[PDB]
Amino acid sequence: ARGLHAARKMLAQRRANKWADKEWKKGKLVTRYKCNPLGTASHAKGLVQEKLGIETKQPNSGIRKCVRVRLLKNGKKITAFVPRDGSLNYVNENDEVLISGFGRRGHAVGDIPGVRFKVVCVAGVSLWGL
Amino acid sequence: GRCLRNHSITYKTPKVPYERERFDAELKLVGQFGLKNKKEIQRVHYMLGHMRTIAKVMLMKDAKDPKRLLEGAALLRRLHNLGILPRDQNKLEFVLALKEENLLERRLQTLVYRKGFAKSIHHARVLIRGKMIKVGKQVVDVPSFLVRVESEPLIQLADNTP
């Protein structure tokens, strides 16, 4: 349709050819409100409930140090990095922390298998300057 | 919007943060005119880019267009009085040939250094900032003061400031 009066097909095509866009669709339909532990919010807050440790993928060896959090707004149970170094000894347990996320990757970034969240506060003045 | 006043920007950061080609050119102008940081060069580039855009818009029109004649002459008149464009070049195409050096050489810090009032371009900044320099009738402590052609020979030291 390349005509001076065909503006209905050229508009009803880039309206039904635009749902096969993976990042546009995923940010239009309703999963960001049911299938997102965070929601719209960049940061959340929850109570640490279990100190954990997650193994690494397999070009790598070691044990990551992370937590388990029940958030206030939703009530879901998540997992989250305890950033850089020797910080699992700053969180204690049942403390209210601040979660931020990681950024992106394929989809999961920091603690290798299935962790997408990073602690930024311990109800203190952040797990950097503590 | 929430406020009834107006607030505008004056500079824009470069697209590519790290280039060695750009870092040396910035340092050449920083040392040559004794500027505080790279914001002052960015302000000059933004100011020049505004005028370049205006001249480029009129240059696409007809030569005798009423819109071009009104806006073209207005841009040239302001540029001549600012001293950026020498009076011999009376055509819009000379605005496009301007560079950041033409504008930087019209700051008060540069002029009072060229007039010999200060030993170095850095001494001029300290002299200006100390309320020590008067332009005609009116003391100035901002080195970014762009002096016009008529106000150029009215720059002199202060007379016993309090």
Binding site: - | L4, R5, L69, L70
Partner: protein
């Protein structure tokens, strides 16, 4: 919006008042009367801004409530009285008489007058209808209702009013050889001579008017206000004489 609005925000005020956008949050809403909201100048605006006789609304009250300001021949004590078109304005304590008139820049300009020409006014007829009892009357742009008029006084004409008596002195027909000052759209304050009057059956009449410098333009019949007959005015025009310098002459004269 349960009823009539009594306030008027500053940014909503008509543009030709030029109320500074940061002076305040409100503008003086002109009380109803002879002239509409957007074709009138409140008495407070005239004194405080155009004449600098007062520096705030408090002082305008002192001047107007002192029984010192006369609109037309009568004397008004309303701070927000709508002063519109050629309606004269006299301050006898200062011995000056003005006339609210349009200029080429789409604005109300105070044209000074002598005491002799401050004794009359030009009114534009708006309609002519037979009242009850077969008594005809005319309604002018001012809003005056005038009893039995001359039978020739039609709808779109102009009359000369004697302010001391209220009698009809002189009338000008709305013909194709008479001067006119536009009061409406883009042509506010422009003065020319009617040269063509093309009428469309359904919607509007558009009039072709030739300026005194040969320039031509068109306007709706609503905006035409006949000033005089045969290029001769019955009132004194403002400084520009209703002639527009197109775009450059105003610029260069302002640079100079």
């Amino acid at each position: 919006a349960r009823g009539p609005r009594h306030h008027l925000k500053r940014l909503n005020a008509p543009h030709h008042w030029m109320l500074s956008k940061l002076g305040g949050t409100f503008a003086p809403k002109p009380s109803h009367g002879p002239h509409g909201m957007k074709e009138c100048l409140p008495l407070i605006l005239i004194l405080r801004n155009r004449l600098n006789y007062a520096l705030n609304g408090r002082e305008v009250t002192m001047i107007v409530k002192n029984r010192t300001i006369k609109i037309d021949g009568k004397i008004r004590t309303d701070t927000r009285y709508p002063v519109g078109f050629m309606d004269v304005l006299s301050i006898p304590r200062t011995k000056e008489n003005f006339r609210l008139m349009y200029n080429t820049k789409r604005r109300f300009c105070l044209v000074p007058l002598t005491a002799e020409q401050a004794k009359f006014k030009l009114c534009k007829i708006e309609k002519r209808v037979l009242g009850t009892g077969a008594i005809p009357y005319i309604v002018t742009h001012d809003g005056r209702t005038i009893r039995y008029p001359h039978p020739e006084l039609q709808a779109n004409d102009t009359i000369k009013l004697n302010l001391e008596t209220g009698k009809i002195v002189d009338f000008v027909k709305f013909d194709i050889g008479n001067t006119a000052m536009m009061i409406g759209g883009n042509g506010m304050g422009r003065v020319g001579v009617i040269v063509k009057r093309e009428v469309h059956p359904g919607s509007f009449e558009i009039v072709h008017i030739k300026d005194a410098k040969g320039n031509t333009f068109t306007t709706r019949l609503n905006n035409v206000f006949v000033i005089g007959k045969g290029t001769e005015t019955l009132v004194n025009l403002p400084l520009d004489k209703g002639i527009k310098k197109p775009l450059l002459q105003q610029v260069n004269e302002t640079i100079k």
